[PDB]
Structures are given as structure tokens and as C-alpha cells.
Design a protein around this nucleic acid. Sequence first.
RNA 1: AUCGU
RNA 2: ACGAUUAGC
Lengths: 299, 1255, 49
Amino acid sequence: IMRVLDSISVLGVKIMPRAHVVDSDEVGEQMEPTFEHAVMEIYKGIAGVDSLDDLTKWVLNSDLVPHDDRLGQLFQAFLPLAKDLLAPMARQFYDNSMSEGRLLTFAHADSELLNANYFGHLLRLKIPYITEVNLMIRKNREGGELFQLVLSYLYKMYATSAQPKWFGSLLRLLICPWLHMEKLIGEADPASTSAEIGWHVPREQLMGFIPYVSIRAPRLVIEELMEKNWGQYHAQVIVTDQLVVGEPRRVSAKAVIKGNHLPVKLISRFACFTLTSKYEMRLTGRGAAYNARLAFRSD
Amino acid sequence: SMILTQFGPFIESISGITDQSNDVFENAAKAFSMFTRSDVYKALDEIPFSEDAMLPIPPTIYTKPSHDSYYYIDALNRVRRKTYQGPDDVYVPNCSIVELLEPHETLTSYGRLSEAIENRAKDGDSQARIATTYGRIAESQARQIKAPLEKFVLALLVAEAGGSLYDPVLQKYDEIPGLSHNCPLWCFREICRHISGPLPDRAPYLYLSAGVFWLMSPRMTSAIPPLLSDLVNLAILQQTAGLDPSLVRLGVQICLHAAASSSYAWFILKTKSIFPQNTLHSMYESLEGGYCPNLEWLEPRSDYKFMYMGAMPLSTKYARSAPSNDKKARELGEKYGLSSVVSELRRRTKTYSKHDFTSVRYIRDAMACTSGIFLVRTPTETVLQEYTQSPEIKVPIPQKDWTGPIGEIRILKDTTSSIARYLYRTWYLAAARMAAQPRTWDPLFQAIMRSQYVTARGGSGATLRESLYAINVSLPDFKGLPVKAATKIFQAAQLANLPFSHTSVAILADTSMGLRNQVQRRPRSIMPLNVPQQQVSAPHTLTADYINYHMNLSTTSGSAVIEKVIPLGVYASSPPNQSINIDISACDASITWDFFLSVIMAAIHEGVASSSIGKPFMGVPASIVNDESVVGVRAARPISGMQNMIQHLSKLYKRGFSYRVNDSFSPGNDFTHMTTTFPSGSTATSTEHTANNSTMMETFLTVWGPEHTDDPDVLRLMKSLTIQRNYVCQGDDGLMIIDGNTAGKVNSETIQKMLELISKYGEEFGWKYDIAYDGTAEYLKLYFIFGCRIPNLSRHPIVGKERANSSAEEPWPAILDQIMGIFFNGVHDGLQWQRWIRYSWALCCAFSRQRTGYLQYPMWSFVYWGLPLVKVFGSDPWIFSWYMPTGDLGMYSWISLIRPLMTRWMVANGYVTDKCSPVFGNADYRKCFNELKLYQGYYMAQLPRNPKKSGRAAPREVREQFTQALSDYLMQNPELKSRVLRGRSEWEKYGAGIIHNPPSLFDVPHKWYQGAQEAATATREELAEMDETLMRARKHSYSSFSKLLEAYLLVKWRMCEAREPSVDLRLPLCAGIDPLNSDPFLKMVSVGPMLQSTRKYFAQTLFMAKTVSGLDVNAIDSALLRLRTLGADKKALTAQLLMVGLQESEADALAGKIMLQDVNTVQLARVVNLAVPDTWMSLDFDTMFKHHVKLLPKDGRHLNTDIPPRMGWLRAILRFLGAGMAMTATGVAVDIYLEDIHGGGRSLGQRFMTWMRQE
Amino acid sequence: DEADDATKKQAKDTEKAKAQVTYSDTGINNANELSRSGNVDNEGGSNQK
RNA sequence: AUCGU
RNA sequence: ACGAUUAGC
């Protein structure tokens, strides 16, 4: 789905590239023992097992259906690791990712995001397909396939009790509105329709526009957008870095919103926009903190 | 000796040596006012100390590192302190501060935080931000004292200059070592001397209104300002309680070790259970005697009916069978370098083998020796440490055990194997029994419950307006008027016309922060929810109230020791029936949406379904929401208003909470935080906490327990007790009672195994029970051993006061009120009565004068405030006790006690008048009282002690639309408005102004406006008006007293025979009271303690259980009783009750009932403004009011004390008139007989009626 | 003690805190039960030495 | 939380 | 352009 969503474009924008997206394994991949390796070494302290394969045999019967008592016993050892070895690092990583841009984050369990104090919209999604057989066909996922099945069961039971909506809602929200914009203003002039919003650091800051959202809409819509006051939306911007390797000279910035957030009905219902975007300043020297405000520039 | 030379007469006045007059008091007050701090320290240096007062001082308190190596900057541009010892090392470091000081002008030797670093932090430097955060945090730590400490030190010096005091009852001087044996005071002097050094100034720091100044010196650190207050507290407690020197020396050693450590607050938090765990938890390893109360509390349990039946001797087999507390105590003493103190305590504890007074006093001293200060830390750190923990659920509810979603709620099928089924069943039955039960639909009930949360206090209105404007809906604003714009009343006025659909967006708003410090405990953060967010959680708190009222055995007790369940602790601490203390650690983060809220919302949702269709609840219309309940088909399932409430609350609980933190101690530290902890400061928190505690304990005792146990004896024990019989829970804490069998007390091993089972059981759903099995009882911070209360002195500091923000302190009358509160707290804690009275008078004199001209309060005002007086008019010293009623009754009591000597004293010196007075005779009491300033003090004490910023000028029609908004908000249902209009109609028809100000629902908006305007800063003109009012009251001359006091003085009494004892004289009921403390011991032995909870007994007196906020039930009942006594037609009472909002039939029936019935003395007393003083509420006053005060004289009817059959309510007033005298005098409470009424019963009743026709 | 050990072994075999089937909570008094141990020799003496 | 700076 | 903001009982 990431590969498919990467190759999606309607107007002169990219909807969801292979960026602005954090993989579920990416939260715990950057540790000296990974979380997968950490939970691999769990047969120690459990009687009657001496290896990961022995643990998989002991916890899974011939039916490949989990034995309730044994898996419930094993969760009592799994949970302390997920509540002491993962949660602080996950919180730090999520906060860092939120600081340097607005990104869509994928996670395996609801409690994984909740216990890390994630600051964002929480969506629970399910797919029609059977995930267990997909795990059983996949290979080389750092350990045994039966280990993957048991670990998936552990994350499933770890999650809280709440009804997950279907993936169709999010996918339709992400894709469908843009096609109507292509139908309407695809024939229209590009520069006349194009518009964007971003932070505006004042010129008299010796050592700038950092886009926040981009709106593609008919000319009348953006003309209506112009006079709306993008004020009382302050943020502290820390922008110091070597150039991000890129098509244009562009350094990366870090903005944190202190006041409220942008209401979507304040933007429009007649105009589409982008859900995720990275932060980078449009232009060297050192960096500092500037209390900037929003601004709406167009052609 | 300079203290003697400058204070000679005053010590003799307040030590029972000579008479106590006003001129000496005023001269001493002036001398207190003009007394420099350096002079205080010189007088301190004049003290000729001795050995036994000297304890070595480590050299490492002064030499400390800097602050840079303790803080850092993390991601998101936030300032926080790096930790060196675990995750709790987030308190104030003990590092030096000298390099951050710039000298202040007008005095060279003092300085404050530099403005250069402040600006360099403001514009964005990192090190400057760290330095200013450290400086502000140290300022906040140093600013935790009521008043400049030198005033308290000087007051102690003046009070203790008197020496030993004679005891009228014991007929001997009190053997207490003088100031030469005061270790903490010597430590204070040594620390001040070492810090001051060559510099002429001697004060380490000076405490101003807003901010304090530091005396720069290389030996100055940040641990000094709490250490000084701690030592002064210890010295005052030693002087006023007779603490033995050894325990105080140990406490000072602990305090110095805490100061010398890395962090004072962190060390004192880590070592806060040294004394209570070595002494209270380890006595009576071997018993040989003593007496314990033989309490027995009746089978009616929800009413707390306790009975006392003598005292039984202690057998040898009633020793301490609890597991030994030696290993962990020794390990803790070894870890923190306190081995000597722990060893001394353990060795000293074992020497007490009899349950006499001495052991209880030793326990009291040990518990008092702990350090009581208000711990402080940066808000961004308490937020990050308290709101990030989450529960650990090891066996969660299986996913297959739920169903399709009813909107955002899934009902849990009763086929589940999880333990949540019983919780769901209990909450479901509670919700159903609520919904069927009919009082929840009368409009008055809805109005009351909607006005519960509308209070003149902040509720995060800025977030509300931001969220509500995010949807382009505009709310009115009010400008130019002086009301506060950051209170929930403002929000209620703003949310009047708006419907629920528009305001439903604000439910998901981000709550603002709150904070308040606490003694020897980490500070608690509080999140106030906006008005609709309080509104949406009404069914939750209501069904929790139902659970706590009917299903379980629990209490919702009050704040003070007087309004608490003391008997239950006395019963649970008796040796035959040992008890278990159960506490839940971090209950705020305990309940989340995974288990508890998930079960509870569904239980409430389908609890009300089949009982209330339609019939919208308060301000929440009914609505429609689909469900996918059964297999594939989905219905529309119309829901009531309460269920829409539940849906909104369920989305709020499922998503979580957003918590804005914008502190002031750290610049550039504003951010937001998402947390899953249940909100504190909401309406429903404590009720649901207690309900869940009771339900989980019950299900453990029933189903989970026996399913996970093997031994037969533990099973026999577990099948025997249930929460309805022996379990009492209030919020976080709880207490369980194990009753004794025929063969003594239950075996300890079974209890230990059961506690292990409880610990195992609690971790399944994310709870960590903090269980202590020590043979004692703890509940609501009350300590009992062997049926004897123990007041924790250190938990009530004398100089401490919590302050979260950096706001300036209130003016001088506020500190007067605070001193009076300190005296009352000392009264409740049982100090040495003579010494405590003397020290209270010393503080009284010290804080009695303030300049602007100068203003002074004559002593008599302070006497009217309730402080007893020692020796006046040449009477016997130490003749009045502090059970004196405060207020008018109190003046009457002592004046009538000492009247025949007052007249003689007046006549003996130049006060003679030919006119004869029925009260004082031929003595010119008018001129004498005017000269003595007694009238001036009596009248000035009644003036308000806060600026009259209420009533400030406001532009018109703006206040009018404001009041209209509150009126519309209060009364949305037309029928209630119709009731109020009717009540006014028949009130105009019948009331005819018989009572001047009848309470009504239309005046609630006015009271709310006044209260909302009150919570604001007062301009200089308001303070000027207040001082002018005090000056005018002082300068004026008054002809006579108030009408009530003159009416009281017409009554004469006689005291023949003392009561027979009600408690055995060898039974220790409470610490601090013993033969060494004659007055409280004799008072309690003669009268007796109250064996019934005061809350229910006071509740049964009221006619109406509760009323709308902004009105007083006491006021309503007083108006009703005035309209009975002053003759009025029944219709007047019906109109009044209609104006309160009661329905016409019920109002008529209640008025008819009230017309003819008689009521107990308390309610009748309220008719003339009399209530039981808060001091008496610790004793059994009801029996004295009923039996031991007899209106019939001891020699039959006198034809003068003839109460008419009309105005029969006079008996209650006479009962308090007698009881005040019976309780004021020292020694044994004495039976008191009515003697004479001057003008006659009918004349006195006419005087009371002509006063009632006022106000 | 040997019956208690058997009960614990059954509890482990069942994977619960308490086994439903127990050999120690039996209501029948069985104080005369003797189980073979190494205390007594074949001749009838005790193996103190 | 704008007239205090 | 910055600034004297908070629970419930």
C-alpha cells in the first residue's frame, strides 16, 4: 500500500510519497537490541522451554490456534518489556518526528500510540484480508514464521477494546477528493489556481517561507481564502542545518505550534489540500528561534 | 535581657502574673512593629545555651556546586532537570546561587535575580534560560512561608521569656526545659552566624510580599530557606508540646543530613517514613497491661452507630503479631546514611511494654519530629512525571468478548470469562435503579445538579472560546465591567442562549493546567474542565453517588478532623480486632478506556435504556445513533438525552485529554500534552473512585479469591467477611476490618497469605495495592493504635503555606485570619494548653499592628475571634478554657462567668454611676468599656477582613445583559420559572416584608455576579476604603453592645454539681491529652468523645437536603423558622418554599408539617444565628445539650423563669446560653441550672422577636 | 508433603493458580496414612545412623 | 494577556 | 511587541 500510494499524482503535487510516513517497525528498529530481538529472548525465565522454536511449539498447538492459557502466561512476560523497554524510546521518537514536520505514522497497536502520548489524530483501521496467512507466506522477517504469528497475536491482544473502522474511510479521504479537483480545474491555469500556506519569518532576521499546507482550488475559492486572517497562529521555528540534498537549495526547519491548530472549515470545504508535509526553509549561516506566524501566498 | 527591658509588662500580663489590659498590649504591639531583624538576631545571640543543645554541623551544607550540570535542554525546546537518582530526582538541587545575584539599590548587602540574565533568557539563550528557571524555582521554594520568619522567632523568644507556668489544676509548675536546651534554635543561630560572617547584616534572606532578596555570601546555598523554617517549626513544637530533647535532636540530625544531600526535597521525600515506621509500627512486642476501649458498633451499618461499653484490661496474648518491620527499616537506614538514628529509634521503642499515657506521648513526639515542608518543583516536570505513567494490565478483556458498536459503545456480553462481568453487572443495576427512581426528573433536581459546577473559580475559558470560535460560532463578550473574565460564571453567562448542538464542539477542548503543593508529598496537578465538560459527565457522578449511598459501606467525609469517622478507627484499632490498611498507588492514571471506563460507559448506556425514553435531561436533547449489535443488520435505536451525554463522554474518554501547560518559572516552556489519566478536579472523580474500589474489593472477596487459594483457614477467613459488613472505602484509600473470634485474634499467617493474594489479584487489571499490616489503622490520614488517636503534628506546619503561582500575598487582615487558623489547628492537635495559649497571644500581639498613620486591633477583638484570655480584672489566672464559643455566645459566657468581680473591679477605681443597671448594677460600664476599647474591639472584629472590591462601579445595561444571561442559564425549564413566579405572587400577598430578605431563585444571578467579581485583584482605592473603615470604627464611641449580647446578659445561671465521669480516667483516648494536660483531659473525661460521625447527625437536622448553588440551606431554614416564630400565616411558608423552587403540593405539605412540629435545639438555635463551635465538635455535646442542662431551677419553679407556651423555641437559646458557661470554665464540666431572667421570659422573647424583625 | 507436591504438580499440569482436582483439601480424615520413606530400616529400627 | 511595560 | 490564569469537595 505504501508503494501504491507513493506513485499517486493528479495535479502538480504528490499526495503521499515514500516520505512523510513512519513505518510501524521504524519506531523500534533503531535500538542496539531491536524489539523483535528483545522479545526473541523471552524463553528464558519460562519453564520447559530452551529455545525460540521450543517456545513456538509450546505456545502453539497442532491446529496453529493459540492455546489460551499458555499465551496468557507468555503475555505476562511480554508486557513488561513493551511497557519499560519500548515506551520511553517510542515517546521520544514520536515527539521528535512530530517536531520536524507533520507526518502520517503507522503503528501496530492502539496501546502503542496511547502509551507514548502521541499528539495527533488516532485512527483504528482493519483490512478485509486474513493477516495470519500473509504472515505465514512471508519469509525472512528476522526469525521464525511461527514467531511472527505469535508476536502478531501478542500485539493484537495488547491492543485495547475499541471498534476499528475500515481502511476504506482513510483511503477514500486521502485519494478521492483530488480526482474531483482534477476534473474541475485540471483544464484551468496552474499558477492561477495554485496556492499555499506556511510560516513567515520576518526579513529583518540576519543570519523566509516554510510551507505548512498547500491548497489547489478554483480562483474564486482562493480569492475567498485570501482575506481570512491567518493570525493568532504562532510557532517557534528552529532552522539550522546543512542543506538537505535536493533539487533546490533548501535547508530543513523545525516548527512547534503553541497556540491552536488550523480548522479545516476555516480553510474550506470547496478546496482540497495535503494531509502530510515536511518542514524546510526556502532560500547559509547559523540558526536560532523565531516566533513566526502563518501567511498565504499565491500568484 | 534586652527582651525583658523592652517587654517587661507584657510577659507578666500573658503569663498569669499580673492583669491583662489593653495599653500594655498596644505598647508591646508597637515594639513588635518597630524591631529590626538584626536586633532579633542580636537578642538571639544573647541566649546562654548549654550542652545538650549542640549537635555537630557538617561543613558541606555551605560548599555546593553550581546549577549548570543539573539541567539540560531536550527536544521540542523544553527545559527540564536531568536525573541522577532514579526518576524522582526532579526536585530543587542543593547547589549554590551566589553567582546569580546583582545587588539591590538602597541596600548594598542584599540582591535579587539579575535582569541581564532574565533578558538573555527572554531573547533565547540556553544557559540564561537554565539560570532563570533555577532562580525562579529557588524563589518559589523560599516563598513557602506565611510571614517573615523573624517575627515567629521573636514571638517565641518573648513567649518563652516568662519561664515555667503554674497549673491551677495540678497545683505545681510545669517542668519543661527552657530555651537553653532548644537544639533547633541553637542550630538556627549557628547557621545564621556562619552565613552572615563579617558582614554586619545577619539575616540570610528577607521575605517580601512578591519576591525575596538573598544575602550574597560564598557560604549561601539554596537549602537554607527550607531548613530555617524547619528548625523554627521544630523549636516551636518543642516549646509548646514538651517534646523530649532526644527525639528533637534526631529530627534535627535528619534535617541537616537532608540539607547536606544533593536535593533537600528529594531527600526528605525519600526519608518520610523513618519515625512512623520505627516507632508507630513496632511497639508492644511484649505486653503486660493497659486499657483499651471495648467498642461495639451496631448492626445498622450505613448509619455508623457506635456504642462504648467500658474498658477492658490488656491480656498478654494481645501482643504485636504482625510480621516484623526490621529488615527494610535497617536497609533504608543503611542506604541513606541514617543508621544511627534508626538504631536509636529501634532501641528506644522496645523499652515501652505497657499501654499507658507515656507510650502514646512518645509516639506523638516521634511522629511530630518528622519534617513538614511544602515540596515544590517545576510544573513541566510534575506534568511529565505524573501524566505519562499508564496502567499495566496483564490479563486484558479478550477481543471476542465484545459486540458491534452502539455508536461508539460496545456492550459486553455476559458470557465473558473475564472478571469485568461483575463490575459491569453492578454498574448496570446501579444505572437501572437510578433511572427508574423518580427524583431525577423533578426540574429542581436538574437545576441543582446543573448549578453544582457553576462556581466563581477558573475553568479554562480561553480554550473554550477558542474551540467554540473554531467553528465560526460567535459568543458575546462583556467589556468595561469589573467582573473577572477567567471564571466558570463568565463561561455560563457566555453559554446562555446557545443550544447544545453548537456547544457540543467545546466538549473536546484542551483543558488548562493547575497545581498546588502539599506537605511531605509530591505536588498534585489538577485539570479543570470547562462548563459543558462538567455538564456532559452528570450520569457518571450520579450513578456513582447511588453506588456509594446504597450498594456499599462507605463514607464521603469532610476536610477537618472534627468532621471525620474517628470512631471507625478506634473500633478497627482495638487489639481483639486487628485491621488492614489498603491504599491504591496513583489512582488517577489507574482507570483508563481499556478496562474500567470501557465497562462503565456501556453499563451506564444500557442501564438507562429501558427506563427513560425521550424526556431530555438537563440541556441535552435526545438524539439518534445507529448500532451494529447483532450480526449484520443495523438499526437506528433512538436514545434519550442521558445517552447522548454518555456518547459525548465516551468519545472524550476514548480519545483522551489534551493538557495545555504554560508555566511562569521557565520562560519559553509552553507546550501541549496528551494524557490518558482520568481527570482530577472533575465533578465525578472521587465518587467513581470509591465506587470502583468497593466493587473490585467485593468481587475479589466473592469470586476471584476462592478461585486462587488452597489453604483451608484462609478460605474460612475469606468466606467470613464482606464489604457490606467490614470494609470502608473513600477514594484512593481504604480500610478493612478483621474482627476477633472467640479464640482471640485471627492468625497472622492467614492474613499475610491473603494480602499476598490481594497483591497478586490487583495487578491483573493494572492496580498496585499499597498494603500495610502493622497492627494499627490508617484512614484519611488518621493514626490509631489500641483504640487511641494520634495527631500527626508535622502534617500541620505552623509557618508553612502552599503557593503554586508567583502571586503576591494578601494584606494584613488575611494574616490575622491565618494566625487564628493556626491557633485553632493547635487546639485540634492537643498541645500544652497553657504554653500554647501564651504563644498564641504572643503571635497575636506581634501581628496586630500595621502602618499605611497606624492601625491597631485592640485585644478584645482577638478575644471575640475566639482566643481565650488569661487573667483580667484581678481574677484568678488561667481561669478560662479554649472551648470558649467563638462569637457572641463566647463573650456572654466569660462575661457572665466573671461579672460579679467585674462590677467590683469597675467600682473600685473611678467608675460609679447613680443609675442602677440590671446587669452591672451601679458601675459605669459604659465609660469603662469605652476607655478599655472593649466596645471598639468587639465592633471592629465584625468588620470584613478583605477589601470590598465587590460593588465596584460598572457601566449599566452591561451588568443587565450579564444578569439576564445567568437568569436564562439557570432556568431553562418553564415550569420551574412558573413555580418561582407563583412563589413571588403569594409572597407579595402574604409575606408583606415580615422578613426583610427572603431567599429566592431570581437573586441567584446577583450572588453569582458578586462572587465572580469578588475573585479579582483589588485596586489601591479599595484598600484605602478598608483602612478608612477600620480607622472610623476604632475612633467611634459606642453606647451599648449588640441586641443579642444584651439579651444574653439578662440570663443568670448556677453551677451546683459536677457530672459523673463518662470515660474511665485510665483509658488513653487520644495523644497529647493526659494529666500533664489538665484542661483537655478533664473536659474529655467529664463530657466524653463523640462516638457518632458528625456529618450524618448534622444532616438529619436540615429541612431541605440540598439547594441550588449560590443559596444557603441554613439561610432557607432560618427564614422558615423566623416566619414560624414571628407569627405568619402558613401561606407565607408555602410561598417561600415555592420561591426556593419546591412543587406546590410538597411545599404546602412541608409548611403544614413545619407549622406544628417541634425540632431539636440546633435548628431552633439557628434562628438567632447560633451554631456549635468547631472546637466542640470533637466531644459528645449532644448529651450535654439534652440532659445535663436543666431549665428548671434546682429549687423548683421561681415564677420568674416561666417560659410561655408560645415562643417555646426559647429553650434552645437558653440551652446554648447555659452550655457556653458550662464549657468555658476550666476543670470538670459541671451540671448547670437556670437561676433567673431579669425582664421575664415573655420580655426576653419580645426582645428576640424585635431583633428578628431586622436583618 | 508428598500429596501436597502432587497437588502442585497437577496445578502446573492444568496451568492455573489452583488445580480443580486436589489431594490435600479432601474432607476425609486420613491421619493414619503412612507413606514409605527412608526413616525406617527393614528390621524396624530408625536410620539415625 | 495589550496601555502595565 | 511582552505582562500579576485556574480543580473537585
